[PDB]
Amino acid sequence: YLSQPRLTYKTVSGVNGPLVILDHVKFPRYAEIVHLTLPDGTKRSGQVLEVSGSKAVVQVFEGTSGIDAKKTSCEFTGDILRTPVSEDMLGRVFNGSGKPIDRGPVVLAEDFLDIMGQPINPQCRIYPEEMIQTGISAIDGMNSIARGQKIPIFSAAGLPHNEIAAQICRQAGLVFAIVFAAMGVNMETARFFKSDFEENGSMDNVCLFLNLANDPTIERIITPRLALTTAEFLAYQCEKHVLVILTDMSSYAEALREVSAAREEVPGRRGFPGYMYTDLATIYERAGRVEGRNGSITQIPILTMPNDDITHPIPDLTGYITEGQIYVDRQLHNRQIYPPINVLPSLSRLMKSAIGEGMTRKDHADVSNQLYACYAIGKDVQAMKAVVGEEALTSDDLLYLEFLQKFERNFIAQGPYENRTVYETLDIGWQLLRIFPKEMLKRIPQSTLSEFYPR
Amino acid sequence: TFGYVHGVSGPVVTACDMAGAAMYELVRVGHSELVGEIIRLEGDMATIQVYEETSGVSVGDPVLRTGKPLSVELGPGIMGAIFDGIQRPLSDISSQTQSIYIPRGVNVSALSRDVKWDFTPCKNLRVGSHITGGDIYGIVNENSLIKHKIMLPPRNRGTVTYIAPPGNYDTSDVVLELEFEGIKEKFSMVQVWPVRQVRPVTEKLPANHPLLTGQRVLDALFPCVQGGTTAIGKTVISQSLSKYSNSDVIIYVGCGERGNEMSEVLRDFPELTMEVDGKVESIMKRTALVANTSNMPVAAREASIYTGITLSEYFRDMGYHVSMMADSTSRWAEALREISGRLAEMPADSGYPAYLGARLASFYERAGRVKCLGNPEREGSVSIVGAVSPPGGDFSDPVTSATLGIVQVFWGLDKKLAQRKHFPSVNWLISYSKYMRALDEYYDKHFTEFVPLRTKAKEILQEEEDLAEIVQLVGKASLAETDKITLEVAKLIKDDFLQQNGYTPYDRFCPFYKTVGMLSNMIAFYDMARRAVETTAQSDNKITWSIIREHMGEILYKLSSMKFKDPVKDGEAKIKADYAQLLEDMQNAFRSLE
Amino acid sequence: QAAMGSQGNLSAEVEQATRRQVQGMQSSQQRNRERVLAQLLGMVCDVRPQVHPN
Amino acid sequence: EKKEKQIEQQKKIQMSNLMNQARLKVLRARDDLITDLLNEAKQRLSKVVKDTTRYQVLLDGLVLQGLYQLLEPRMIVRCRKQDFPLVKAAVQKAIPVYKVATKRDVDVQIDQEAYLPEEIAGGVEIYNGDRKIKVSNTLESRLDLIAQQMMPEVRGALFGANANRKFLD
């Protein structure tokens, strides 16, 4: 226990941007929690970023506007940031700091968990092998997800990435709590995930952490940490299956670039800080199964690539931590395709061992490898049609343009309320592979072509 | 002997009252014994780089000093173990704590001190003989395969005054006590070597034996020899290379990769089997691991490459042929970027430091076949395999162009086929292997017709890269029919021969007879097609490439069916009994055309 | 009339579910609100001063 | 037959809000039981202010617990007007303890110009010389410290343990 009383300071020896620099602090602890009281009487809370002898550097969450040097209290709690967790936070709506905004009471804690995470031994983890049937044919028939896979939805500004995600939460199941975390979203997106989880009647399974667009910026550092700590409590101590939805992880890093700017570290790639890889690896790696516990965390973050560049530091450093990605592109969005999922840069690194005989079907791994190679070829013939015209194309290349008109309308394009099974997706995928003759499916062997092709 | 924390900032702890502490020596930061090196000295202080997350360290906390740098325990009990970057055994922490978490600042012996190993000395030694560094003074059957030759540490010599009898010993029981000029020193089975210092050797020999991988790329095209330094689903080619090597010891490391990709390693690696003389045995009887996920702190990631190469340098000095798989090299240089960014070090290119061309050099140049230090006539070799991971799909990142000046073999993915998976590709602008002249005595001896095949298989591919730019500009109009074939056998090689699905059971290992068998049937087809055009060219019955596709549509599928041969369920002379029948149907498919 | 009538009659079992567990959780409060009050008064009156990092 | 589907979908929301306001009624009526538990504990701590000898050895520690939190050459104690004869009898008992501890010197006085309110019900609030750092251990800052760290055990003792929390106690 902390049974000593807390030292209340009034020695603020410098404010600079989002930082408050104290002095005459008696044995300050790193990553401490302070509680600042402004002159007018309001309270903000902050976290120590550096101690050096007798002085601390406090990262104030709600911004340092109005904080002076004379009458600003800073009560040092002497503890790292611990959140109160329980099972009765399934069904509540918290803000980005963890304070409730459902017009209800505070959480009566079952335990106090450190929000920064405590890493799991990789020797005692289970490999995620059981597949999640998500309904959507593009992220199930070619980019399948297992229980425990970290897999982001790469998108950009305007595309229906929040309707793609809410479709998965309606349709996820095998072939189940939700911990939602909104970082810097607008009011109309938080209105959308609420009214979808209200109408579905799954509100007793959803725990929403909403940091809206006018909520303060440096709370977004702790909002995916406050949500994932609830998930790691509900999955490893309550033995529940958790789906964690971290929307606009771009708004994580712009509030992390903000705190490192006025701190003046060495900047990295595109002005983002140096430690951005291990910081997103602090967040994305809190997922998976463990040995001896029947719960799991399946992570789906959501990004926005700026100017649709997949080589920006937010989707390029996310793709080095997470296991595959789901790409949402702008060109299929203008052509009225829902969901607009480009399967050429999409990937599921856990698809290879989660499909096959005894899990889904014998020919799953062969169909998706052939539906890849026909879409990847007929997109190259389309760029050869723009040079030599429609007339100079051989009769086995009017087949690859036939495929693209039937791939992105009969397989990709779904409609937001189709619950297409893993067998209904494959049975669509073979009537696209009967477009070709038998002697061009060069990625499918003879043992599966003799049984599944002629129907 | 003792210090106090003056200030922390992330993993950078500044400690006071450390007057005579050295550079790169370890301390114990905080109340809970978090390890940490020393990277600076400023008068009386010392800036510490910490190998664990420092959340909760106050000022005034004790900084205990050790008298040694960062080092690993080299001894019996390595084979099968799984380590982190600073060599903590994750299989002994998963049982002593009975929990799923790694504690902060946890302390446990890297090798187990209770288990008993049988000792059998070298039989050429006695009580009273002169011993020198590297001299084997005992052999221990660590398991059924790997005899564990206990050697004297370098910079140690004297005369034997005590050697243990043959019995069961745990690793702390003193066996050797050598007499020197005055001082005598008592020795054990576990030696301690610093992870940044190169283990001494007498000579470094030219490497001449082929290290045979499992991929059809870099076995045929860009070969590697036993002692070379290569570089390159970059993580699905990497660990499918480690699982099928013909070495003696496998040293896989993972330098900061995904978490459930470390769950896939420790599930498939125990369940793999390896044939021996009659029996079959698990490969984890000869394989050590280093497990470092990106979840783990950034300083412990940087020392996970030094921990891997010092284990593989120890087993080289017994006389074995080890092979180190250094996964995610560019995540290691990303640890160097972040570490130096905390120290306000002036970055040279793209945020990377300037010593990245030395830190990657101080790793790859510990490879190579050697003549081991010590008297009982040993010859060891380390083969280093990198795994480069360029950010943003651009191949002018400062980790690639620093590696190009160091390594001997290098094959990289294409420019176009980086975001879309067509695996593997080639990238002829930087791909090379300087062991192509050093493997011609091997090739004429055992396979004897592969090198005429490879020069034509590189000639079809180097001519299609000329023609692909002009078909993208003219569009198959300025192509005589002898060149429309070379557009199509290069489409048949890059889709069927080069492209290898490494996570299917029929292609995770491709033996070198099967690679030559797959390459014989395509270069035979290219010679039979290009005679069927050029002999009927100027007069009528002009056999074009179009006529070849309509009548031989079932045979070009069967050429694309040569990769679906399983090299275990089918035989070796069963696969060759089905490749020659494709030749006798390919020869009978042009006699119908002429 | 089966839409409005099956709401309010269901809104009876909404308000009958709550009173059964509101009266339950306040009947378990009165049993041992002296196990906790002998504890959290005994630890308030158990001050013990120290100095941890010198 | 679109106004038909609109009512059935809206019926799913009206079911979901009546089921949502059912939970928050219970959880507010649980947070009122805790609020009347701390309110019951505050006045039972206002019978510890009485007896003047149990309270005397409570201010004996509460004064010295300030003197070990800040280690300063000058400190001042700011207490109530009522038990100022007791704080003077409680400060002087700490100086033989505090000075042989830590081998330091000190000068400690008591404020006579700005007292605590007479509603605080006990405790002391030790400053330093320049009045910039402050430890506050009244009985109410001691109550609102140990209670907030004991809500795990208060929840398991008052309303029964959780059933589905298997691991970690």
Side-chain angles (χ1 to χ4, degrees), chain B residues 313-326:
Chain B
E313 271 188 350
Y314 172 53
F315 285 99
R316 167 199 72 171
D317 289 29
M318 301 174 177
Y320 293 157
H321 289 278
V322 315
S323 175
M324 181 187 164
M325 173 68 248

Side-chain angles (χ1 to χ4, degrees), chain A residues 363-385:
Chain A
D363 72 304
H364 192 169
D366 314 283
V367 163
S368 91
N369 280 318
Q370 187 53 259
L371 291 193
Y372 282 156
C374 299
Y375 190 66
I377 276 172
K379 287 277 269 178
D380 188 22
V381 186
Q382 191 189 1
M384 255 294 286
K385 200 212 267 193

Side-chain angles (χ1 to χ4, degrees), chain A residues 29 50-51 53 121 123 127 129 148 150 277-278 285 316 319-320 322-323 346 372 439 442-444, chain B residues 6 8 56 90 94 100 234 258-260 264 267 331 334 338 390 392 420-421 499 549 554 557 560:
Chain A
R29 192 190 299 274
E50 182 195 4
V51 302
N121 195 359
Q123 206 263 336
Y127 183 50
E129 270 173 301
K150 44 196 91 64
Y277 181 74
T278 79
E285 277 281 297
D316 170 82
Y320 288 158
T322 63
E323 314 177 62
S346 308
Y372 282 156
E439 321 308 315
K442 308 183 197 295
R443 307 280 318 170
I444 306 189
Chain B
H6 179 71
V8 312
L90 310 176
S94 56
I100 75 160
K234 51 177 189 262
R258 319 159 158 83
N260 314 324
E264 196 202 289
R267 182 213 45 175
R331 300 317 109 190
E334 207 155 296
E338 186 185 319
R420 158 76 190 145
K421 40 182 189 304
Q499 176 174 13
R549 188 192 270 130
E554 280 267 5
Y557 175 75
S560 158

